[PDB]
Design an enzyme around this catalytic site. Structure first.
Site, PDB file in Angstrom:
ATOM      1  N   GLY A   1      18.379   7.001  10.704  1.00 24.69           N
ATOM      2  CA  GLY A   1      17.026   6.807  11.140  1.00 24.69           C
ATOM      3  C   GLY A   1      16.589   5.368  10.990  1.00 24.69           C
ATOM      4  O   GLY A   1      15.840   4.875  11.841  1.00 24.69           O
TER       5      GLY A   1
ATOM      6  N   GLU B   1      25.840  -0.890   5.776  1.00 29.82           N
ATOM      7  CA  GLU B   1      25.802   0.032   4.625  1.00 29.82           C
ATOM      8  C   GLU B   1      26.551   1.322   4.914  1.00 29.82           C
ATOM      9  O   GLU B   1      26.287   1.964   5.902  1.00 29.82           O
ATOM     10  CB  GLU B   1      24.381   0.385   4.197  1.00 29.82           C
ATOM     11  CG  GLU B   1      24.357   1.043   2.823  1.00 29.82           C
ATOM     12  CD  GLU B   1      22.988   1.396   2.307  1.00 29.82           C
ATOM     13  OE1 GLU B   1      22.064   1.611   3.091  1.00 29.82           O
ATOM     14  OE2 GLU B   1      22.850   1.508   1.087  1.00 29.82           O
TER      15      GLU B   1
ATOM     16  N   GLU C   1      11.763   2.070   4.019  1.00 30.41           N
ATOM     17  CA  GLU C   1      12.578   0.887   4.149  1.00 30.41           C
ATOM     18  C   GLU C   1      11.984  -0.310   3.408  1.00 30.41           C
ATOM     19  O   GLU C   1      12.729  -1.167   2.862  1.00 30.41           O
ATOM     20  CB  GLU C   1      12.724   0.536   5.636  1.00 30.41           C
ATOM     21  CG  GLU C   1      13.450   1.592   6.455  1.00 30.41           C
ATOM     22  CD  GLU C   1      14.740   2.005   5.815  1.00 30.41           C
ATOM     23  OE1 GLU C   1      15.388   1.092   5.249  1.00 30.41           O
ATOM     24  OE2 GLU C   1      15.105   3.219   5.845  1.00 30.41           O
TER      25      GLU C   1
HETATM   26  C1  LIG Z   1      15.396   8.808   4.545  1.00 31.24           C
HETATM   27  C2  LIG Z   1      14.844   8.277   5.875  1.00 31.24           C
HETATM   28  C3  LIG Z   1      13.310   8.229   5.776  1.00 31.24           C
HETATM   29  C4  LIG Z   1      15.483   6.945   6.383  1.00 31.24           C
HETATM   30  C5  LIG Z   1      16.970   6.796   5.981  1.00 31.24           C
HETATM   31  N1  LIG Z   1      17.355   5.392   5.681  1.00 31.24           N
HETATM   32  C6  LIG Z   1      17.753   5.013   4.457  1.00 31.24           C
HETATM   33  O1  LIG Z   1      17.833   5.684   3.436  1.00 31.24           O
HETATM   34  C7  LIG Z   1      18.181   3.624   4.234  1.00 31.24           C
HETATM   35  O2  LIG Z   1      17.291   3.316   3.179  1.00 31.24           O
HETATM   36  C8  LIG Z   1      19.727   3.624   3.933  1.00 31.24           C
HETATM   37  N2  LIG Z   1      20.096   2.636   2.977  1.00 31.24           N
HETATM   38  C9  LIG Z   1      20.437   3.444   5.307  1.00 31.24           C
HETATM   39  C10 LIG Z   1      21.741   4.196   5.607  1.00 31.24           C
HETATM   40  C11 LIG Z   1      21.769   5.527   6.025  1.00 31.24           C
HETATM   41  C12 LIG Z   1      22.990   6.169   6.301  1.00 31.24           C
HETATM   42  C13 LIG Z   1      24.194   5.487   6.186  1.00 31.24           C
HETATM   43  C14 LIG Z   1      24.165   4.176   5.773  1.00 31.24           C
HETATM   44  C15 LIG Z   1      22.961   3.536   5.502  1.00 31.24           C
HETATM   45  C16 LIG Z   1      17.868   7.373   7.040  1.00 31.24           C
HETATM   46  O3  LIG Z   1      17.997   8.613   7.159  1.00 31.24           O
HETATM   47  O4  LIG Z   1      18.488   6.565   7.749  1.00 31.24           O
HETATM   48 ZN   LIG Z   2      17.036   4.717   1.975  1.00 33.64          ZN
END
Ligand SMILES: CC(C)C[C@H](NC(=O)[C@@H](O)[C@H](N)Cc1ccccc1)C(=O)O
Ligand SMILES: [Zn+2]
Ligand SMILES: *[C@@H]1O[C@H](CO)[C@@H](O[C@@H]2O[C@H](CO)[C@@H](O)[C@H](O)[C@H]2NC(C)=O)[C@H](O)[C@H]1NC(C)=O
Ligand SMILES: *[C@@H]1O[C@H](CO)[C@@H](O[C@@H]2O[C@H](CO)[C@@H](O)[C@H](O)[C@H]2NC(C)=O)[C@H](O)[C@H]1NC(C)=O
Ligand SMILES: *[C@@H]1O[C@H](CO)[C@@H](O)[C@H](O)[C@H]1NC(C)=O
Ligand SMILES: [K+]
Ligand SMILES: [K+]
EC number: 3.4.11.-
Length: 858
Positions: A268, A134, A305
């Site tokens: 994260g 992603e 998640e």
């Molecule tokens: C907001 C937090 C609790 C966790 C957060 N993860 C997400 O939002 C996932 O749902 C995202 N879809 C993951 C992601 C983050 C950055 C770049 C590409 C993909 C993250 O910061 O990685």
């Molecule tokens: Zn997210």
């Protein structure tokens, strides 16, 4: 000449199914693949454009269904596309299979199909290979139609050695020996999904597992030495998954969910369907060494998640302009879910906080609407920011309070049912919510299609309450929102509601009031100003009987007072006068909000030749909270709230050299060290204790000597923080050089290490230099404009306050041309610096003189 000149793929070649074979070599760091994708064409064409980044394609063929033909391969590396050229046109409506054999190198970054390492407790290095696609990295693992609306099913095959374990989105159907020393694992075909959700991992992980009431096998995976820290996340996953199945009224479609702790991870965590991935720090809990904030953090991240399994996986945004459909909803559901599942965390107390965060960026011209056009990868990555997440959550909280909670729930359920296994735009959500005067769509367009937020101004003349709205912006718009205003008064505890849809309006109270407070519980993305005797009335209330309004209301008054200083509606003096009420405050949110508004003032000073006033200002802060500091026990007792507050105040008092805190800290560190780390320290004092201990060479070296061996994410975090507080320039360079090298401190920590050193009164010059001298390798490692790069740009510059410094910042980023000069974060620091220059030019002297008048209390 490459035959397609747009970043977006053609619309008329649609995949239905991918069959993916991936054979990775964890010793040579190479991989080979064979992608087969079944497609059909809605227009006639003898060219097929799809995505591919840094794969060497050796061969591409087209199957009809028997008949096979070779395809000519052309490459467009900037567009990240390949053109496959058929000798005959594709016939419309007929099925074709495109078959591509290729090879790659495991990525050395944190995206694509990438390498991750760890150390055994016996000191041996270990390699595993994991994925993170992603938004646009799927195309680095396998060639594909890499946009979220080309949803398809996936059948994944991983070849590997016997000593390894492979896992992917779905359960393992079977394992086949294909040669001596080589096993092929066959995973079950997935449901229809976006390419960015494909995941696979090859490791020697271990697991623990539990079955939901609904029969889903949940498992946590981690390295063998850390699997005993998986228990808390496993309980949490089961409970939260069960919660959502009930809340959304749509079961989890897959037979298993895995949660994998990856030792090298940039974000994260990530929501890949059936195989969610996490920083170790976001998943693993150690009963004896982990903090209250870290436990809170694991629960929310898991909540987040697993929320995506409906919001993002099952229903996905059509294009990244509407990313907030995934990320805003996920961030919001964290609070909806965890406040039922783990009521002891009281997470609702902290919701507000995110809203204020978003307002810092959103108050600037350089912000953007929640839903806004993007095209290229760097642009798409920049959507993963505080507007999509935190404002997305805040406006949903607002809509939710405005309809019932049940009405809201019904809308999202109809939405998830209607768009299951499909893609939505912004307008689709609103049609759903509009089908549960009341006009949700016009209302929510004001909140999603224009940037910023309003200032609501309140004027009270007897019983008439005049409400007014204009666009809040720090240095014409005519923007208007439909704002669900709430308010309480001195006469009733009952909450009153008014939908302000126009520039002004007025309501008539049934009796005159001593006072009135708007935006109750801070459930509104807007700030309020009170005309006439209004703030003096509210300041008098907080000084006499602060508990006449809630904690959250107190926190919102503090924040709005200071936001209004920045645009000229309230004087810095009247806001600091309001601050004085904190002498009597006891609650985490308003104490933390005070700090959030006050610490940055001394931060600006710290970077200037301003020691007399910096010191007076810091003395004042400690004196303001001195009672609450002196009331803290050096223990791990109480609620998560009490603990977090404890840990922050103790750190604060010690960092500012409050001598009773410091002497105690020195003492705890001496006994700790003299037991060679054996004595157990209370987790909540350990930041304060390590920070004090790291001010000596003896202590710093000692602390660093324990980092090597620790298995506790919290303990490492605490040591990192402490080592970054040193005033020895040679040690700050070392930390920067090492985390960047990644061998003795991992590079996943570099961004935050770079920021903590940029926050160090004698480290900021070193951090700003390092970011500049090392920009290209950092961009290669983290990508333009990831959050990481964004946090680094702002973490090293946004506390500058002078024109000389502004010209430095501008000159460096300009020179970067196509390699960073268009970054949104760069525009954000620049406008931040610009606001700092003016805020400090106006208020510096005002504060100097106010600090003096505030000693006409002595
Ligand atoms: C907001 C937090 C609790 C966790 C957060 N993860 C997400 O939002 C996932 O749902 C995202 N879809 C993951 C992601 C983050 C950055 C770049 C590409 C993909 C993250 O910061 O990685
Ligand atoms: Zn997210
Ligand atoms: C995997 O990595 C290798 C080595 O770093 C790449 O092969 C090199 O390609 C460069 C640059 O074009 C040549 O000058 C070198 O001579 C190559 N070295 C070897 C040993 O072949 C290779 O291109 C990578 N694979 C992919 C798809 O990018
Ligand atoms: C990855 O490449 C290595 C190195 O060629 C493969 O090597 C096997 O393991 C050792 C290390 O050299 C050799 O002694 C073996 O004889 C090689 N193979 C066999 C069957 O004996 C390794 O198998 C490859 N791994 C994968 C997953 O393809
Ligand atoms: C606000 O944004 C746009 C886009 O960058 C720009 O044209 C305009 O100059 C900006 N306003 C101010 C005061 O800088
Ligand atoms: K239900
Ligand atoms: K953008």
């Amino acid at each position: 000449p490459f035959p397609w000149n747009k970043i977006r793929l053609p619309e008329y070649v649609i995949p239905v199914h991918y069959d993916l074979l991936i054979h990775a070599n964890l010793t040579t760091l190479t991989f080979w693949g064979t992608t087969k994708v079944e497609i059909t064409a809605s227009q006639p064409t003898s060219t097929i454009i799809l995505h591919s980044h840094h794969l060497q394609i050796s061969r591409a063929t087209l199957r009809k269904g028997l008949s096979e033909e070779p395809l000519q391969v052309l490459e467009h590396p900037r567009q990240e596309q390949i053109a496959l050229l058929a000798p005959e046109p594709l016939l419309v409506g007929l099925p074709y299979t495109v078959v591509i054999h290729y090879a790659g190198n495991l990525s050395e970054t944190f995206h694509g199909f990438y390498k991750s390492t760890y150390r055994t407790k016996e000191g041996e290095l270990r390699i595993l290979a994991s994925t993170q696609f992603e938004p646009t990295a799927a195309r680095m693992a396998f060639p594909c139609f890499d946009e979220p609306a080309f949803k398809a099913s996936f059948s994944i095959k991983i070849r590997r050695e016997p000593r390894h374990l492979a896992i992917s989105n779905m359960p393992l159907v079977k394992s086949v020996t294909v040669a001596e020393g080589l096993i092929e694992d066959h995973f079950d075909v997935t449901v229809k999904m976006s390419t960015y959700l494909v995941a696979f991992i090859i490791s020697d992980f271990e697991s623990v597992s539990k079955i939901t009431k609904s029969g889903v096998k949940v498992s946590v995976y981690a390295v063998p030495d850390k699997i005993n820290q998986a228990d808390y996340a496993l309980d949490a996953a089961v409970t939260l998954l069960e919660f959502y199945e009930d809340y959304f009224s749509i079961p989890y479609p897959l037979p298993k969910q895995d949660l994998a702790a990856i030792p090298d991870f940039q974000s994260g965590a990530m929501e890949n369907w059936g195989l969610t991935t996490y920083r170790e720090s976001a998943l693993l809990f150690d009963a004896e060494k982990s903090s209250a904030s870290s436990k809170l953090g694991i629960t929310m991240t898991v909540a987040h998640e697993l929320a995506h399994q409906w919001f993002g996986n099952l229903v996905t945004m059509e294009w990244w302009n509407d990313l907030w459909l995934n990320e805003g909803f996920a961030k919001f559901m964290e609070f909806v879910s965890v406040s039922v599942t783990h009521p002891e965390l009281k997470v609702g107390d902290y919701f507000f906080g995110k809203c204020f965060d978003a307002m810092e960026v959103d108050a600037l011209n350089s912000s953007h609407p929640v839903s806004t056009p993007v095209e290229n990868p760097a642009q798409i990555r920049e959507m993963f920011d505080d507007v999509s997440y935190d404002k997305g959550a805040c406006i949903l909280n607002m809509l939710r309070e405005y309809l019932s909670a049940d009405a809201f729930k019904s809308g999202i359920v109809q939405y998830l049912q209607k768009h299951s296994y499909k893609n939505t735009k912004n307008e689709d959500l609103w049609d759903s919510m509009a089908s549960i005067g009341v006009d949700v769509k016009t209302m929510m367009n004001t909140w999603t299609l224009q940037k910023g937020f309003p200032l609501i101004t309140i004027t009270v003349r007897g019983r008439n309450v005049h409400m007014k709205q204009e666009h809040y912006m720090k240095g014409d718009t005519g923007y208007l929102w439909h704002v669900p205003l709430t308010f309480i008064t001195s006469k009733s505890d009952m909450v009153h509601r008014f939908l302000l849809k126009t520039k002004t309006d007025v309501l008539i109270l049934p009796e005159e009031v001593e006072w009135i407070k708007f935006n109750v519980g801070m459930n509104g993305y807007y700030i309020v100003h009170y005309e006439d005797d209004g703030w003096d009335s509210l300041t008098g209330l907080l000084k006499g009987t602060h508990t006449a309004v809630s904690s959250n209301d107190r926190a919102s008054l503090i924040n709005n007072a200071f936001q209004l200083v920045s645009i000229g509606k309230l004087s810095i003096e009247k806001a600091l006068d309001l601050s004085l009420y904190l002498k009597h405050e006891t609650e985490i949110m308003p104490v933390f909000q005070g700090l959030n508004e006050l610490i940055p003032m001394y931060k600006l000073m710290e970077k200037r030749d301003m020691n007399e006033v910096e010191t007076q200002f810091k003395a004042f802060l400690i004196r303001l909270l001195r009672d609450l500091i002196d009331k803290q026990t050096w223990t791990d007792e109480g609620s998560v709230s009490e603990r977090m507050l404890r840990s922050q105040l103790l750190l604060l008092a010690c960092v500012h050299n409050y001598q009773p805190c410091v002497q105690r800290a020195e003492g705890y560190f001496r006994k700790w060290k003299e037991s060679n780390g054996n004595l157990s320290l209370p987790v909540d004092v350990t930041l304060a204790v390590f920070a004090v201990g790291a001010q000596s060479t003896e202590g710093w070296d000692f602390l660093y000597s324990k980092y090597q061996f620790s298995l506790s994410s919290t303990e490492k975090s605490q040591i990192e923080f402490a080592l970054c507080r040193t005033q020895n320039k040679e040690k700050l360079q070392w930390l920067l050089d090492e985390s960047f090298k990644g061998d003795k401190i991992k590079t996943q920590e570099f961004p935050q290490i770079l920021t903590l050193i940029g926050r160090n009164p004698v480290g900021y010059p070193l951090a700003w230099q390092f970011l500049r001298k090392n920009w290209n390798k950092l961009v290669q490692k983290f990508e333009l404009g990831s959050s990481s790069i964004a946090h680094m740009v702002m973490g090293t510059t946004n506390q500058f306050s002078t024109r000389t410094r502004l010209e430095e910042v501008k000159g460096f980023f300009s020179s970067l041309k196509e390699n960073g000069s268009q970054l949104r974060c760069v525009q954000q620091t620049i406008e931040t610096i610009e606001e700092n220059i003016g805020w400090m030019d106006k208020n510096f002297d005002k504060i100097r003189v106010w600090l003096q008048s505030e000693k006409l209390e002595r």
